[PDB]
Structure formats: C-alpha cells, structure tokens
Amino acid sequence: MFIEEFEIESITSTHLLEVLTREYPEVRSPSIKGAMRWWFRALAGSYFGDDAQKLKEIENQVFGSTKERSRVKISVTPLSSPKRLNLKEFKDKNVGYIWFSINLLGKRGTITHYYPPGSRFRVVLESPSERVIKLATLSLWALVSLGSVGFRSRRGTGSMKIVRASSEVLEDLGLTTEFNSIDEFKDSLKRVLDVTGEILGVSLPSYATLKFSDVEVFGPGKNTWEVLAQFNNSYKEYLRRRIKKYQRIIFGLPRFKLRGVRKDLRRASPLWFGVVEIGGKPYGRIIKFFQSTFHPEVRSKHIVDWNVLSNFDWFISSRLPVTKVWGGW
Structure with missing residues (x-):
C-alpha cells in the first residue's frame, strides 16, 4: 500500500476549462492527471524511441485504458476557491498578447472565474506496485518541473510549484521538491533520466521526449x-x-522555395x-x-x-x- 502525497500551488494564473473543450476545440485544458500521463510518455519514450507499441503497453499498464484498470490511483482536490476575473489585468500586467484568447473568453462572458497565483491543490498517488508509484511520482515531478496545466499552459499559465509533500519516492531517488540553484535543476534532470531507465529495464523518436x-x-x-x-x-x-x-x-508573389543545405532546416x-x-x-x-x-x-x-x-x-x-x-x- 504505497502512498505519495503532494500540495502544489499555482505560480501563474491557472485556467481549468475542460468543460469548454467540447464546443471549442482550441480550448484545450490539460488536467493534472492528463498532464502526468503526458509526461510519463516523454520520460519513458526517451528509452523506447521507435518502439511506440511497447510505450503504449506500459502507459496503459500504469494509467489504465478502455480495456484496462489503472495500477495507480490519482486523487486531485483543489483547496482554493475560484476567484473573480478582472479584465483590467491584461492591459495592467502587460499579458494581452500571450493570453489574448483568455481575454477574449473573458469579454464574451464565457469564463468568469479562474485560479489566481497562490491557488493550492492536493495530489495523492496510491499503488500496490513500487515500480508503478515511482513512475507516477516521476511523472508528477516532471509536470511541476517542466510542464503546467490548463488553457494556454504552453504560454505561461498554470505553472506550478510544490509547497509541501510526503514522498518516500523522491527521498529514495535523491530528488528535491524545490530548486535552490540552477545546478540542482541541471542535476535533477540527469537523475530523473537515469533512474527512469532502470525502473523499466533499459535514434530520434517521432514523439516528444525529455531526452531530446x-x-x-x-x-x-x-x-x-x-x-x-x-x-x-x-x-x-x-x-x-x-x-x-x-x-x-x-x-x-509566388516563388519557388529552395531546398535547405541541411536536412530538416x-x-x-x-x-x-x-x-x-x-x-x-x-x-x-x-x-x-x-x-x-x-x-x-x-x-x-x-x-x-x-x-x-x-x-x-x-x-x-x-x-x-x-x-x-x-x-x-
């Protein structure tokens, strides 16, 4: 009965808008569970490379599928209440181009609340397997360290930090829950890469990986x-x-493109x-x-x-x- 517990906090404005995705496909809003799954593929994919089949086998084996039950239970409960959106914020804070789409939904009244910096979330991971819980925690570690969640999270929203945790896995792997220096950041990435391979056993891939x-x-x-x-x-x-x-x-004016001197230039x-x-x-x-x-x-x-x-x-x-x-x- 392994168990890992985390409290994460929003550093930037967070917009969890999975509700809107059905009518408007541009409004993609990665959840914590969804982003963890994404980051597992980026970690594990670093070792499987070409073999996309083997990657999907382990991914389903950890996170579950339509024919499968997840070997890990992920529980996410928000500890903060959504707050009222101030439309003056975009001009005021000089964020109107990177978050243009949010500003537009705001004016149209499609969204009224968001999670401002300081919003906190509890994330709890449970699994019978040691192999699985390690991989789950590494995923979450990666999500906080390099990723983010919600609408426009590739453009600065939904950046997270870990405020407090109880993690025997991170302790075991010699990792931290915060970066005191850039060098700690550098070393942790190497560690996460090196460890992930061992837990799985052991040429550019066609999907995003941490390694590349x-x-x-x-x-x-x-x-x-x-x-x-x-x-x-x-x-x-x-x-x-x-x-x-x-x-x-x-x-x-129609012009013929010239071929790059370098392949994929x-x-x-x-x-x-x-x-x-x-x-x-x-x-x-x-x-x-x-x-x-x-x-x-x-x-x-x-x-x-x-x-x-x-x-x-x-x-x-x-x-x-x-x-x-x-x-x-």
Whole structure:
C-alpha cells in the first residue's frame, strides 16, 4: 500500500476549462492527471524511441485504458476557491498578447472565474506496485518541473510549484521538491533520466521526449508578473514579424522555395514557456521539443492561435541572458 502525497500551488494564473473543450476545440485544458500521463510518455519514450507499441503497453499498464484498470490511483482536490476575473489585468500586467484568447473568453462572458497565483491543490498517488508509484511520482515531478496545466499552459499559465509533500519516492531517488540553484535543476534532470531507465529495464523518436529536448531559463525577475511581461513583449514582436512573413509567403508573389543545405532546416520545433521558481525567485522557463514528426507552422485558425516555435528564442535571448539547463541537441 504505497502512498505519495503532494500540495502544489499555482505560480501563474491557472485556467481549468475542460468543460469548454467540447464546443471549442482550441480550448484545450490539460488536467493534472492528463498532464502526468503526458509526461510519463516523454520520460519513458526517451528509452523506447521507435518502439511506440511497447510505450503504449506500459502507459496503459500504469494509467489504465478502455480495456484496462489503472495500477495507480490519482486523487486531485483543489483547496482554493475560484476567484473573480478582472479584465483590467491584461492591459495592467502587460499579458494581452500571450493570453489574448483568455481575454477574449473573458469579454464574451464565457469564463468568469479562474485560479489566481497562490491557488493550492492536493495530489495523492496510491499503488500496490513500487515500480508503478515511482513512475507516477516521476511523472508528477516532471509536470511541476517542466510542464503546467490548463488553457494556454504552453504560454505561461498554470505553472506550478510544490509547497509541501510526503514522498518516500523522491527521498529514495535523491530528488528535491524545490530548486535552490540552477545546478540542482541541471542535476535533477540527469537523475530523473537515469533512474527512469532502470525502473523499466533499459535514434530520434517521432514523439516528444525529455531526452531530446532543450530547457532554458532566464532571470530572476522582480516578480512573476515581470517575467510574464517579458514573454509578452517578446511574443508581440515575434507575432508582428510572423504576420508580415506569412502574408508574403501565402498571399504574395509566388516563388519557388529552395531546398535547405541541411536536412530538416525549416522544420522548427514546439516551444513552451512558463515560470519556474529557483532559490525563491521567479525565472522564465523555456522548453523545446525535437522529434521526427513534422509539425506545421501553418494552421487553419487565426495566426494569433498558431503554436509558438523554437525560432522564438531569439526574441528572448537577444534581449537578456539565457542559461541552458538541459541540452538534448
């Protein structure tokens, strides 16, 4: 009867909007359970690579499926009450471009409440298996360290930290529940990678993995909002040039593209950002995922909703010092 308990807290505004996803598919809102499942695949996938079948076998074996029962029980209860949304916040805090979509739902009255910074959630993990509970906790560790939850969580919302926990698994693996330095961050990623392989037994994959990714930070800032504001200024200019670029490419004068001198030269990769706390201070966190599957920069929706890609890093790194935390490339 293994058991792991956590209290996590929102660092940035959190928007749990799974309800809206049925009518509006753009409104994707990863839950804690869902994001843990996602991050398990990124960890385990680092070792299975090509063998996508074997990955799905273990994933179902841990988290359950339609024909299966989960070997772990995950319980998530919010400890805070949702608070009233102030629409003045977007102009005031300089977050109006990265969180444009939230601002629009706000005005349309589609959402009225959210979970502000300081919102707390209890996460409890239970399993009969030691192998399973270790993998579950590693997943959650990864979700807090590199991920986030909710609507627009790839763009700074739903960044989390662990305020308190009782975890024999993290104790066993020599991991922490907070980062006191960037070096602790660097070392933990190596540890999480190294351990995950052992628990499972033991050529670029076609899906996102931890192993083949880049993690970077910048800061510290005065406060969280200042960090978010930096992302917003950068993204505004990124989007400005993006609009001009694709007006040319798609609707301008027809030109023949030239083949890259390097294979997959114009195949840029997904980029997520959010806020990580290091030494009690807020840092901007960026993660870039490199895999085999091609992901279009072009989507049949408004360009403001287009994914942020890895060529966005210039608009951060040209303006302030960036530290590499993990180099999969």
